[PDB]
Amino acid sequence: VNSFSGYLKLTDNVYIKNADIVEEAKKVKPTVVVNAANVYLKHGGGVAGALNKATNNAMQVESDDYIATNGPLKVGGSCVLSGHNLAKHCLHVVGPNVNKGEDIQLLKSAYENFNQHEVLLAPLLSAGIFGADPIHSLRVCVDTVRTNVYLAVFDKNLYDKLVSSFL
Ligand SMILES: O=C(O)[C@H]1[C@@H]2CN(c3ncnc4[nH]c5cc(F)ccc5c34)CC[C@@H]21
């Protein structure tokens, strides 16, 4: 038993809700919140910009030190950093950005990072400003992640579409 509430159960291990991941994060204090990061950890907009704003830019300050030491992530890759006031940890995961021409097959590799964590609060990778089809992203999530994932979907309309079309 964990503290996530109001989720719809899609599979043995995948759950979905219409929620603002920032507000869900501040209420659950999950062990892991996933950020929809880019390779430079430049948290300017989308989920990343919202999450970073909620940390009063501390996420960005920590991320800039990470990049200065380690260089950029790979598309499909991840790193674990602090969750600041939102979670114990933030798993920054880079899905392919269709608006940059990145290969959508990397979406599976991106979701594989979730399997290193027993429970996660996450957005749909490569959705939103990353330009992928959120229904495809949900399918890849369900077919790739084996750990317990709680998907927060900001847009109510999108959600109702994700649920109603889920096979
Ligand atoms: O590509 C993106 O950046 C994310 C678009 C929407 N994404 C979100 N998904 C769950 N919770 C969310 N809260 C937000 C608050 C915001 F100001 C902005 C976005 C989000 C958001 C994920 C898919 C894609």
Swiss-Prot record:
It is found in: Host endoplasmic reticulum membrane. It catalyses: Thiol-dependent hydrolysis of ester, thioester, amide, peptide and isopeptide bonds formed by the C-terminal Gly of ubiquitin (a 76-residue protein attached to proteins as an intracellular targeting signal). Signal peptide: none annotated. Residues 1-167 form the Macro domain. Changing residue 31 to A: In strain: Mu/B.1.621. It comes from the Viruses. Inhibited in vitro by GRL-0617. It is a multi-pass membrane protein. Responsible for the cleavages located at the N-terminus of the replicase polyprotein. Participates together with nsp4 in the assembly of virally-induced cytoplasmic double-membrane vesicles necessary for viral replication. Antagonizes innate immune induction of type I interferon by blocking the phosphorylation, dimerization and subsequent nuclear translocation of host IRF3. Also prevents host NF-kappa-B signaling. In addition, PL-PRO possesses a deubiquitinating/deISGylating activity and processes both 'Lys-48'- and 'Lys-63'-linked polyubiquitin chains from cellular substrates. May form homohexamers. Interacts with N protein. This is Papain-like protease nsp3. The chain holds residues 1025 to 1191 of 7096 of the full protein.
